[PDB]
């Protein structure tokens, strides 16, 4: 008799170990997932890493937005611009279109400061005008002074000065990103204080 | 201030030790180097015969002979090329890093019709990796026969070769040392020649005494020429090659006889110039995705000499099935000629290889039977490419063929789905499951198929990862039918009836939420069932039932986060089913009846069955079904 | 000897330069969208310089012609000097134009390569193979002819393989002797071991029969996994190296059954003769 | 005869072109080579100071500095080493393939207490990978300082250097090309030093004018900052593995792997012989989120030769199942390529692999004694241990003793197979186990009821990797692993149970065959044995093939062949319990009338519920749902 064979062992091997499976997006400021300042300092540090890496490769973005960020399962943030997922997140130079090419790193640092503000306060910047006509007025006039009064209590003061300097309307005095790495380092070192 | 100009010197003994010892990590490349030198000699003597055939009047043939000899422990490689005079025998074979091949090539620059394999000048001394002492017996057409000899000690001797005369060429005699006698074995020589120099344009012949005569005395020598039997077919123009010749080359490439499915013969010209020839195997290899097989599908050739095989930088992991040859002329090579100096040249090559492979697949998608066979073989690779290769996702997705409701037992393309799709419909309705029949007759697809909408089945586990990244096709998004809130074109009557139903079915829904507060995170009424009472769809964020099954079955997964991205079960009930009508009638009378909660939990468990989930433990469900069958047949 | 043209290559979707805090699928599109913009800007720059050079060449030709005309005509000495000054200014502009041309030539030299400019497509040809599929099982026609050719040419290979017993030696040999594994060779091996059992050579009996059963097992495995037996023979030895004791039990039971069957066939042949 | 001896020569221009172009695949290793030369010089001067400290009067500190100068497009590399005289400057730096370091090492002569990272003599010329002109300004103790200068044009000049004086050592000025300017930035310099030469025995301090000067009572950004950060950490593995404390090991581990917490266990060992190396192996406290993501490649183990990076771990240095192990392997005598980025003998890595694997397994064995820490190790790397059981075959016996499992007599704590074998009865000759999907899914399951009734232990394996582990693990001490989900399960019985089972089989054979006809192609055969207590039916798998969970695992693998999906699957052997009321009350309904619609439906439903309980998915679950709904409607009154 030729039996049945009991051969097996064809492809019962541990084949390629695949990846993927994430937690969620960044549009969670309306979900109200606000936590203690540790998980906010870490997010700011990782996103500053990403922005500084982008600046090193001389890549101009100008389009940093709460929609343009993604959080991953390992508590790592992948800041990749996920297409659509606009208003109030731009820069006066971008809005004016005087040169027809407003692509400059100062726009990146202004957008980063706006992102830091909306991350640390948990509320949209300039959260007092919801009119399409009115919002463009501030950037068109070239003088836009935001307010920082909804800050969460018991937080390090480095972020306050950082967001104050980042959103300033002088293109030759905004803080560069090498400043931001030192700022976030002293920020995480000032957590226990 | 004074300037004392000097000139760079070299320490010859240490330089020779560097070339012998710290220069070639693979000891078997010496044969490749010697055969490349022989090929260069033959190319020289064949190029000189172009102007006048008198240069060839010492033997017509241009051949390479490999002559192992284990009695004296020597390996002789004989060519009939150009040879070299005493002056050349000194200048080229005595001066390290000086190449007569380079000088010969740089001399012409006006009738360039040869591609000569050599520019560095150190390749010959690689013969000292395996040989303790080499003797080079050459004979040019302009000089007498000479006998170069050196033990790599710092000196070489040149004699007049008072012995056996050779007509022309060179005869490198490697007195192999004690350790490296393995290169006299026929199998080892055949393996090395086939691996490294098997597309050399001159017959490479192995000589050994193993053939018997009529049936003893093996004195006769086996003139085994079949070391270089397969000629490089990618050199000829694509118009000049017939299907049969491509098939023969493909069979010779794979060490197994079977025809190929399709062929791609292309070339790019510019700063980076190469000829490629890519083959789609007729059937997928039985170990195609076994990671233990490394990767050797695509082989890189520089001037018809093997350099490196596939790496992740030459061909993506999802195109590891398609095998071929990439031959280039000008590539910046390492000193050992087994890797490129610039490694991103490999990536620029890959950028063309992948584009041409996708063009080959697209052109293969014009005869339905051939592509049906190709898809049955490599649909997994296509979907892996959709998941992994993002820059080609749009083009790769048009190569997807899926079973669907309106096609039957033939797979149909998503573009054809969009063509047949109704104007009112504005999404791609797909169901991911475990088999063809399991999803064909399922709770979620009942209403969609009843209204005539086409549904794309996705049976294989690879489809979960395929649709992780395929979130949109042709501008119309892919929405699962197992996810909650399935948006469907609602007529006025249907939506009015739905509003009335949720205005009528709220009490038992609150009862469901109360009895099932941890298992189920929402109970509602939706119009996706026609003939089933309840199905558990998953919330729009998280893992579906099938995706959760697949990811839970993975052998190597971080089990800590399995509950991090787990499904959110949303049990839903079908208002028109008689079971839910009776249940509502029984729940209106009282909310704490034993029968009500029994039937509700059993409905939830049987919908967990139907929806593709798995229970916490099916023993409880089996025990309750056994108690019910005992009640039915009456044994207490 | 000189690799200075391959040291500046900017591949966009370069997988080995990725930041684990940036989306690789979105990192590879930022690089592309900047690369194409650099190309467009440089193209417009060199195009406008080319048209400016053409315009200045036409202007200097016209000014030279007008200078010749004014020199021919008497009475325009002051106009001749004014046009000489104008032509000197035009020639200064003309010679300054090539400064920017050399500048952009140097910039092109310093501009890195990429997949778009490294190579230009040559002559590509895709052509699909259409060959008959499936095989036929017959006891006559080509199968018998192939059997006779195989036994006439590869008798020595069959004998040498049958003389071996070692699993590793068998695998190495069959790696060098892939032709020995097919259904026709299986039939020849069966009839050959039956003939040997007629001749009553016990050592050669078991030596041939064990390898015959090994090849039959390999063929059964190949029929099971839907790939040709001529290539998968290598995996059966590795399988039996780590196989369960039950696999050895089944193999030895098949050995015993084959022994009994071939012994019965040999006894019947002897009795008939 | 007419023999005539010549001498081997070289073409210098071509040889220099070979060094510059065809030796080193990465241009950034010029800095590694220069720092290696600086380290060799410092070793020279220190060793010479050991005998006569009178030659250390021309400077005391032994320090390497890198001074990028973006203004002049230069990268100086000063060093307070030994310097070179005019003769040494002409010979060592002018003659290709001649090494002064090798000459010095060969002059140590029984008293050699130092190691040097220079032997070939071509390393210095890697500076022309990035630098178009190299100006070396050296100063020996017993010679004035000379300014060597070359452009790799086949000539060099050696002037008197009437410029600014230095006490000792060498100042290798590189004039970088117009396009190799990325090596002036702090990012690339720090990256290169960290990657290649971060364990050089002397402080490598980097200089840049980026300091923000203090201003109070503007925005000044022009001040040099001496950043010795390039070489803060020391090569701890050069010390004895006994005089080091756990805090030093933890600090080194945190610095090496950038972990925010220290290590879990450390194995520090070195082997002496023909192949010698010091190895420092750490077990990370928490496994990475992508430990098995092979597309991330592998750099866990780093190979150093004389404290200089050679190559990060490949497939041949550490097994894939030990890829969690972080550490370094440092060897003094390893033959290297000309690029020093690989070993000449790749077969050496196999001996190193054997030693590393043996010592890692010894580390695991010595860690297991402290159960408090072994639980922390196991709950993180049990998958790796089981993958080692599956793949590795020579260390399977040693690796099996590190397996901890849930049994039926343990509770919430895992126990090893040795504790099993300790608690087995005298008449038990096997280790019972079950492969399921969760702990509770198998704790109360059909196949385990009788076994726990007799008070046997059952190992609960609720992970997908466990089926792979146990299809290879076939014994322990002599007690074979026998699944309770497979057919032919034998328990220690006596004559009484044997005759009772024989009577039950003889009574129920008619029911079994009738059920087989009802379930013709859906069950291979219907059995009766002692596996169930309070359940009527459970389907077991043929004695060899795929269990229910194994088939469930292999049907859900993304990259699996879709052609062998039927040739290995289970041969479902349904079993009935001859003591449960349900099956015997339908035995009467069977012997009363074989063909009965009620009996048909009951048998099909019972087989389907056994299918669900055992683990096999239904062929089409909507059929089971529909028959459940019909039965609910019938028993509910609608
Ligand atoms: N069989 C041969 N016939 C003629 N000349 C030969 C032969 N073998 C070697 N030579 C001579 O030896 C010289 C140097 O040999 P070697 O192989 O080291 O250099 P190469 O061919 O330039 O190779 P590589 O650049 O790969 O190191 C060649 O220029 C050639 O003139
Ligand atoms: N900074 C330095 N101080 C002292 N001697 C130096 C210095 N730089 C180079 N040298 C001398 O120059 C010689 C040649 O330089 P090179 O770096 O090429 O050689 P090597 O270090 O011995 O070789 P390799 O590193 O390639 O094995 C060295 O052997 C050493 O004697
Ligand atoms: Mg050569
Ligand atoms: Mg050095």
């Amino acid at each position: 008799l030729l039996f049945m064979g009991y051969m097996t062992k064809d492809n019962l091997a541990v084949i390629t170990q695949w990846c993927e499976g994430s937690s969620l997006y960044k549009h969670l400021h309306v979900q109200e997932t606000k936590f203690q300042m540790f998980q906010l300092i870490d997010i700011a540090r990782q996103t500053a890493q990403g922005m500084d890496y982008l600046h090193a490769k001389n890549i101009i973005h100008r389009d940093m937005k709460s929609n343009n960020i993604f959080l991953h399962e390992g508590l790592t943030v992948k800041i990749g611009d996920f297409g659509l997922a606009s208003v109030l997140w731009m820069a006066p130079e971008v809005i004016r279109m005087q040169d027809n090419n407003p692509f400059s790193f100062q726009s990146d640092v202004y957008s980063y400061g706006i992102v830091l503000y909306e991350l640390m306060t948990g509320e949209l910047p300039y959260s007092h005008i919801n009119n399409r006509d009115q919002i463009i007025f501030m950037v068109g006039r070239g003088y836009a002074s935001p307010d920082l009064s909804k800050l969460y209590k018991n937080c390090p003061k480095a972020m306050k000065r950082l967001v104050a300097d980042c959103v300033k309307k002088v293109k030759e005095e905004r803080p560069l990103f090498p400043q931001i790495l030192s700022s976030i380092e002293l920020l995480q070192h000032s957590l226990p204080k | 201030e004074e300037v004392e100009t000097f000139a760079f010197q070299a320490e010859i003994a240490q330089l020779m030790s560097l070339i012998i010892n710290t220069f070639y990590s693979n000891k078997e490349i010496f044969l490749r180097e010697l055969i490349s030198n022989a090929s260069d000699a033959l190319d020289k003597i064949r190029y000189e015969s172009l102007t006048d055939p008198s240069k060839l009047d010492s033997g017509k043939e241009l051949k390479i002979d490999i002559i192992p000899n284990p009695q004296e422990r020597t390996l002789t490689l004989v060519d009939t090329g150009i040879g070299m005079t005493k002056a050349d025998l000194i200048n080229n074979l005595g001066t390290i890093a000086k190449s007569g091949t380079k000088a010969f090539m740089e001399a012409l620059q006006a009738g360039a019709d040869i591609s000569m394999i050599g520019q560095f000048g150190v390749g010959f001394y690689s013969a000292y990796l395996v040989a303790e002492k080499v003797v080079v017996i050459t004979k040019h057409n302009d000089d007498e026969q000479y006998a170069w000899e050196s033990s790599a000690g710092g000196s070489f001797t040149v004699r007049a070769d008072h012995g056996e005369p050779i007509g022309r060429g060179t005869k490198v005699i490697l007195h192999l040392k004690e350790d490296q006698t393995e290169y006299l074995e026929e199998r080892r020589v055949k393996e090395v020649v086939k691996k490294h120099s098997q597309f050399i344009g001159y017959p490479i012949t192995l000589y050994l005494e193993k053939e018997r005569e009529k049936k003893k005395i093996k004195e006769k020598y086996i003139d085994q020429e079949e070391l270089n039997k397969t000629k490089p077919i990618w050199t000829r123009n694509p118009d000049d090659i017939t299907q049969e010749e491509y098939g023969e080359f493909y069979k010779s490439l794979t060490n197994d006889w079977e025809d190929h499915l399709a062929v791609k013969h292309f070339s790019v010209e510019g700063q980076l110039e190469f000829r490629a020839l890519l083959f789609i195997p007729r059937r997928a290899p039985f170990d195609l995705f076994e990671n233990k097989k490394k990767k050797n599908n695509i082989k890189l050739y520089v001037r018809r000499v093997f350099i490196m095989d596939s790496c992740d930088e030459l061909i993506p992991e999802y195109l590891n099935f398609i095998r071929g040859v990439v031959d280039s002329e000008d590539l910046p090579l390492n000193i050992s000629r087994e890797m490129l100096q610039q490694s991103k040249i490999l990536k620029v090559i890959r950028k063309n290889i992948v584009k041409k492979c996708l063009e080959l697949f697209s052109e293969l998608a014009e005869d339905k039977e051939n592509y049906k066979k190709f898809y049955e073989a490599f649909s997994k690779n296509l979907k892996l490419g959709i998941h992994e290769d993002s820059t080609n996702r749009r083009r790769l997705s048009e190569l997807l063929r899926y079973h669907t409701s309106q096609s039957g037992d033939e797979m149909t393309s998503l573009s054809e789905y969009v063509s047949r799709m109704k104007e009112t419909q504005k999404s791609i309705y797909y169901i991911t499951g475990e088999s063809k029949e399991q999803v064909a007759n399922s709770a979620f697809v009942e209403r969609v198929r009843k209204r005539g909408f086409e549904v794309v089945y996705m049976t294989e586990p690879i489809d979960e990862y395929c649709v992780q990244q395929l979130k949109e096709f042709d501008g119309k998004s892919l929405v699962s039918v197992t996810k909650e809130g399935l948006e469907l074109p609602e007529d006025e009557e249907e939506k009015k009836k739905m509003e009335e139903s949720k205005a009528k079915f709220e009490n038992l829904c609150k009862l469901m939420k109360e009895i099932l507060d941890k298992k189920v995170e929402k109970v509602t009424i939706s119009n996706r069932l026609v003939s089933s009472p309840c199905c558990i769809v998953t919330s729009t964020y998280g893992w579906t039932a099938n995706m959760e099954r697949i990811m839970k079955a993975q052998a190597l997964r971080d089990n800590s986060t399995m509950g991090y991205m787990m499904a959110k079960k949303h049990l839903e009930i079908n208002p028109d089913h008689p079971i839910v009508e009776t249940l509502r009638q029984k729940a209106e009378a009282d909310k704490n009846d034993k029968a009500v909660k029994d039937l509700v939990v059993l409905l939830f468990e049987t919908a967990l069955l139907s929806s593709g989930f798995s229970l916490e433990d099916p023993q409880t469900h089996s025990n309750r079904i056994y108690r019910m069958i005992k009640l039915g047949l009456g044994i207490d | 000897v000189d690799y200075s043209v391959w040291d500046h290559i900017e591949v966009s979707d370069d997988e080995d330069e990725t930041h684990p805090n940036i989306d690789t699928a979105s990192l590879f599109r930022w690089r592309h969208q900047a690369r194409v913009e650099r190309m467009e800007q440089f193209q417009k720059e060199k195009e406008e310089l080319d048209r400016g050079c053409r315009e200045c060449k036409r202007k200097v030709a016209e000014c030279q012609r007008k200078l010749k005309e004014l020199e021919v005509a008497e009475g325009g000495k002051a106009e001749l000097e004014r046009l000489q000054a104008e032509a000197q200014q035009l020639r200064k502009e003309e010679r300054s134009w090539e400064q920017k041309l050399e500048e952009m030539r140097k910039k092109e030299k310093s501009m890195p390569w990429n997949v778009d400019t490294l190579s230009k497509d040559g002559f590509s040809k895709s052509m699909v193979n259409t060959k008959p599929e499936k095989t036929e099982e017959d006891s006559e026609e080509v199968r018998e002819q192939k059997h006779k050719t195989f036994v006439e040419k590869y008798e020595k290979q069959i004998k040498h393989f049958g003389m071996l017993r070692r699993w590793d030696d068998s695998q190495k040999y069959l790696s060098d002797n892939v032709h020995l594994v097919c259904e026709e060779t299986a039939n020849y091996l069966v009839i050959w071991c039956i003939d040997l059992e007629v001749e009553e050579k016990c050592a050669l009996m078991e030596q041939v029969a064990h390898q015959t059963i090994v090849m039959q097992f390999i063929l059964e495995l190949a029929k099971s996994l839907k790939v040709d037996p001529r290539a998968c023979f290598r995996q059966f030895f590795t399988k039996i190296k780590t196989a369960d004791r039950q696999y050895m039990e089944g193999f030895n039971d098949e050995l015993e059954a084959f022994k009994e069957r071939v012994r019965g066939r040999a006894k019947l042949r002897i009795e008939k003769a």
Side-chain angles (χ1 to χ4, degrees), chain B residues 435-561:
Chain B
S435 55
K436 161 73 157 164
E437 57 205 291
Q438 160 151 338
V439 291
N441 324 297
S442 53
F444 320 93
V445 85
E446 279 175 4
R447 171 70 77 77
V448 197
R449 285 177 64 185
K450 162 177 144 193
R451 211 194 278 248
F453 290 163
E454 196 173 7
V455 152
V456 166
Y457 302 156
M458 299 198 188
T459 287
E460 296 83 20
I462 185 59
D463 293 287
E464 265 86 57
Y465 313 80
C466 169
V467 294
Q468 265 177 341
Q469 322 288 347
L470 192 62
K471 299 158 225 295
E472 186 140 13
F473 185 99
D474 204 359
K476 44 198 47 54
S477 39
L478 266 70
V479 307
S480 188
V481 303
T482 317
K483 297 210 143 315
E484 83 152 15
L486 168 137
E487 181 53 49
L488 209 153
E490 306 293 271
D491 206 8
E492 195 73 38
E493 181 166 75
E494 166 185 37
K495 59 162 146 298
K496 291 176 314 203
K497 290 303 191 295
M498 260 305 304
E499 311 176 310
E500 277 133 31
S501 291
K502 341 163 274 182
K504 176 208 278 182
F505 280 95
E506 61 286 359
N507 296 332
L508 88 171
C509 276
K510 305 191 213 170
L511 202 173
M512 302 322 192
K513 201 76 173 59
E514 171 265 310
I515 176 170
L516 315 172
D517 49 290
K518 329 172 83 63
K519 322 151 157 223
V520 154
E521 320 230 325
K522 156 166 275 207
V523 178
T524 186
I525 310 107
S526 288
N527 45 7
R528 72 173 82 219
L529 312 103
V530 85
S531 160
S532 303
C534 66
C535 71
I536 314 147
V537 296
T538 287
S539 65
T540 176
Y541 295 131
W543 279 352
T544 62
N546 207 46
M547 169 63 98
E548 181 184 300
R549 176 187 62 93
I550 294 308
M551 293 306 257
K552 276 185 11 195
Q554 293 322 318
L556 299 175
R557 263 282 312 261
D558 215 15
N559 49 39
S560 166
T561 64

Side-chain angles (χ1 to χ4, degrees), chain C residues 32-67:
Chain C
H32 199 6
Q33 283 324 130
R35 185 176 74 83
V36 310
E37 192 40 52
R38 316 178 173 150
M39 277 142 204
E40 276 153 301
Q41 152 74 60
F42 204 9
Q43 193 143 60
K44 85 169 288 313
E45 196 48 69
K46 64 192 152 199
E47 267 146 11
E48 70 155 51
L49 269 283
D50 196 327
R51 64 166 55 88
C53 198
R54 282 190 306 196
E55 282 161 57
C56 80
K57 179 56 173 61
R58 169 74 187 154
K59 286 167 61 174
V60 70
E62 281 183 86
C63 91
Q64 282 191 104
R65 182 176 87 91
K66 197 164 51 157
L67 267 167

